């Protein structure tokens, strides 16, 4: 019957979330890469992520030199 | 019957969310890349993300030099 | 009957989450890569991630030089 | 009947989570790669991750030189 | 009847989790790679991870030089 | 110079709910100052709520602040 | 110079719920200052809630702050 | 200079719930200062809640702060 | 200089629940200062909750702070 | 210089629940300072909760802090 049903009940009082925080000082070539399939938070739920047959969920960071 | 049904019940009192925060001082070449499929917050829920057959959810950051 | 049903009941009072925090000072070539399938938070749940047949959930960071 | 059903009941009072924290000072080529299938948090649950037939959940970091 | 059913009941009062923490000072080529299938937290549960037939859950870090 | 010579009662209910509170009771800055007097007293009630009831209330009592430069 | 000569009662209920509290009762800064007086007293109630009840309340009592530069 | 000469009662209920509390009762900074006086006393109640009840309350009693530079 | 001459009662209930508490009762900084006096006393109640009840309460009693530079 | 001359009672209930407590009762810093006096006394109650009840309470009693530079 049910196929991929999700119930999320969240009851918080004080929720402080910082997804991506980057601090750079006196810095040269620098990569901060965040992505693909990222769930961040007091109540973080992920279901059936990357469900495609040839699907790609990626995060690629680099410094080619 | 149900296929991909999502119930999200959130009850917060004080929710502070900072998705992407970037601080750079005296900095040269620098990449802050965030994306693809990113869910951020006190109640963060993701369902059936990247469900396509050849679908791509990506975050690519780089410094080519 | 049920195939891939998820119940998430979260009841917090003070939830502080820092997904990705990067601090760099007097730094040269540097990569901070976070991604693919990342769940972060006081209540972090992941179900049927990377369920595709030839699916790829990856995080690649590097410094090619 | 049930195949892949997950119940997550979390009841916290003070939840502090730091997913990825990177501190670099006076540093040269350096890679901090986190990803693939990462679940982080006071209540971290993972079910049927990497369930695809030829699926790959990976985190590759390197310094090619 | 049931095949892959998971019940996770967590009741904490103060949960502090640090997934990945990297500190580097006066450091040259250095790789910190964390990933594949990583569950971190006060209540960390993993079920049927790497269930695919030819599935790979890996974390590869290296310094090729 | 001041001279004073000479069922329910005095019941006080206070309910205070505040998020942010920044209170500076007394703040003094002096710069190249010669003869300065900052006198803050008597019965001073300073605060985000700041309730005062029956302050002096005495038969021949005093609540005073006396600041001066006598020269 | 001051001279004073000369069922329920005095019941106080206080309920305070605050997230942030920053209180500086007395703060003094002096710079190249010669004869300075900062006097803060008597009955000073400083605070985010700051309730005062029946402060002096005495028959011939005093709550005073006396600051001066006598020269 | 000050001279004073001369069922339920005095019941106090305090309920305080605070997350953050930063209190500086008395803070003094001096720089190249010659004759400075910082006097903070008497009956000083400083704090995030800061309740004071029946402070002086005496028949011929005193709550005083006296600061000065006599020269 | 100050001279004073001259069922339930005095029941106090305090309930305090705080996460963070930073209290600096008295903080003094001096730099190239010659004749400085920092006097903090009498009956000083400093704190995140900071409740004071029946402070002086005596028949001919004193709660004083006296700071000075007599020169 | 100060001169004073001259069922339930005095019941105190304190309940304190705190996670973090940082208390600096008295902190003094001196730098190139010649004649400095830091006097902190009498009846000083400093703390995250900091409850004081019936402080002086005596018939002819004193709670004083006296700091000075007499020169």
């Amino acid at each position: 019957t049910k196929e991929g049903v999700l119930y999320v009940g969240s009851k918080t009082k004080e929720g402080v979330v910082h997804g991506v925080a980057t601090v750079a000082e006196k810095t040269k070539e620098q990569v901060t890469n965040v992505g693909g399939a990222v769930v961040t938070g007091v109540t973080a739920v992920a279901q059936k992520t990357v469900e495609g047959a040839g699907s790609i969920a990626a995060a690629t960071g680099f410094v080619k030199k």
Side-chain angles (χ1 to χ4, degrees), chain A:
Chain A
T1 304
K2 288 193 283 186
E3 208 293 349
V5 184
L6 166 57
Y7 305 61
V8 178
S10 160
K11 185 177 185 293
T12 165
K13 299 290 181 68
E14 199 206 293
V16 177
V17 183
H18 294 86
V20 186
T22 312
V23 184
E25 181 209 348
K26 288 150 154 313
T27 302
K28 229 194 268 213
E29 318 110 309
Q30 183 255 321
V31 180
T32 288
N33 177 62
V34 180
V38 185
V39 189
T40 324
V42 184
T43 325
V45 194
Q47 198 190 249
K48 267 142 172 303
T49 183
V50 195
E51 176 200 350
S55 34
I56 302 141
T60 315
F62 56 93
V63 185
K64 213 168 272 186
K65 175 178 178 180

